[PDB]
Amino acid sequence: MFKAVLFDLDGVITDTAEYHFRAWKALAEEIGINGVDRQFNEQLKGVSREDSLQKILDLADKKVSAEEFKELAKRKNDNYVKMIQDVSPADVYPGILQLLKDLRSNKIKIALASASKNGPFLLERMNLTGYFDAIADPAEVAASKPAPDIFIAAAHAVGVAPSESIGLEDSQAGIQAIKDSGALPIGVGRPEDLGDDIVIVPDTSHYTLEFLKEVWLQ
Ligand SMILES: O=P(O)(O)CC[C@H]1O[C@@H](O)[C@H](O)[C@@H](O)[C@@H]1O
Ligand code: ALF
Ligand SMILES: [Mg+2]
Ligand SMILES: [Mg+2]
């Protein structure tokens, strides 16, 4: 049986993928780039703050100073951090709180494998911190999603092999990161976005311990 579940945060635990999208699009438009629509945003899900800004600049062939780059990333983060102040336990996605409870009852380790430096704050806002056996610090890894490092680190932090772990993701980049870690991915979203080659569920109510077992037994 699997021994750990490795959670992405944004778009898996709560609806903060929407907030990142709104903040990045606002930033992009302030600098005169309007290609950041929902379709393009599928390339931004899972990607670090600086990598996201670079993808937006590259979309437009735009070349800012190092000083401006730093200011833009900070501006977007400051806006995002204001957006999330009112996140609460009521914003936890369907199924997720019960999944965490059921995993703990079955002695399955729970680790956060999020790129977000705002992750710990968000788990506290949602009264979820106590469910997590570890939070992999995304500043510690040498390579960000789609590299597998953050999922490998999350599994290591709870003493479980990636190959005995399930990863939960809503992003193209994150699904690739899970694949390359050796863990088993279960995506949440549209197969049109996430692929026809892994198990995908349409919403997080599908993330039950029963279903994770169903999939693992395979
Ligand atoms: O470090 P932060 O700026 O809080 C978030 C860094 C990245 O986290 C990921 O979980 C999201 O899918 C990305 O959209 C985001 O860019
Ligand atoms: F949506 Al994440 F790390 F929380 F990619
Ligand atoms: Mg996500
Ligand atoms: Mg604790």
Side-chain angles (χ1 to χ4, degrees):
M1 182 59 70
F2 60 98
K3 288 177 175 183
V5 183
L6 316 179
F7 286 78
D8 179 53
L9 199 170
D10 309 304
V12 171
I13 294 176
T14 188
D15 204 28
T16 43
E18 182 67 12
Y19 292 51
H20 281 300
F21 165 57
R22 293 181 191 180
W24 279 123
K25 180 185 187 83
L27 190 282
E29 293 194 348
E30 280 171 343
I31 61 171
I33 295 174
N34 236 56
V36 185
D37 61 13
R38 287 187 183 283
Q39 179 183 27
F40 180 74
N41 185 250
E42 292 298 312
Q43 301 180 47
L44 300 182
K45 294 181 175 174
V47 175
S48 74
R49 191 184 308 162
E50 285 75 15
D51 288 348
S52 290
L53 177 55
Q54 192 57 56
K55 290 180 182 294
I56 291 164
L57 295 172
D58 287 351
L59 172 68
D61 312 303
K62 188 181 282 274
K63 238 82 190 300
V64 305
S65 72
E67 175 183 57
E68 187 167 354
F69 186 98
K70 188 183 175 301
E71 187 280 323
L72 289 168
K74 177 175 187 295
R75 189 193 306 175
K76 179 268 173 177
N77 187 57
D78 288 341
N79 184 28
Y80 176 75
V81 168
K82 281 178 169 171
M83 295 175 170
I84 61 172
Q85 292 301 309
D86 279 340
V87 173
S88 82
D91 298 305
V92 178
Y93 265 163
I96 295 294
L97 181 58
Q98 194 63 59
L99 174 63
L100 294 166
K101 289 167 176 175
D102 293 344
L103 291 171
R104 295 200 71 81
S105 180
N106 287 265
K107 300 186 176 180
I108 296 166
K109 297 289 189 174
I110 295 164
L112 197 74
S114 180
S116 179
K117 289 173 185 171
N118 292 296
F121 173 78
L122 280 164
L123 295 184
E124 289 287 9
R125 293 297 323 130
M126 292 183 285
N127 285 7
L128 293 181
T129 309
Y131 292 100
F132 284 77
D133 298 301
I135 297 174
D137 180 351
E140 291 275 20
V141 296
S144 305
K145 299 173 193 182
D149 301 41
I150 195 72
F151 285 99
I152 298 168
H156 171 72
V158 298
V160 175
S163 64
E164 293 298 318
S165 302
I166 292 176
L168 307 181
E169 262 285 353
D170 68 317
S171 73
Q172 293 165 356
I175 283 167
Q176 187 61 50
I178 294 165
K179 286 176 178 182
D180 289 335
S181 76
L184 186 66
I186 308 177
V188 54
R190 310 191 306 123
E192 288 84 354
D193 299 318
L194 300 183
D196 67 351
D197 66 315
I198 66 282
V199 174
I200 303 292
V201 299
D203 67 87
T204 57
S205 74
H206 286 264
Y207 286 153
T208 60
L209 176 50
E210 314 297 3
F211 183 62
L212 272 55
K213 290 178 168 192
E214 184 189 343
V215 174
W216 193 261
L217 286 278
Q218 195 155 342

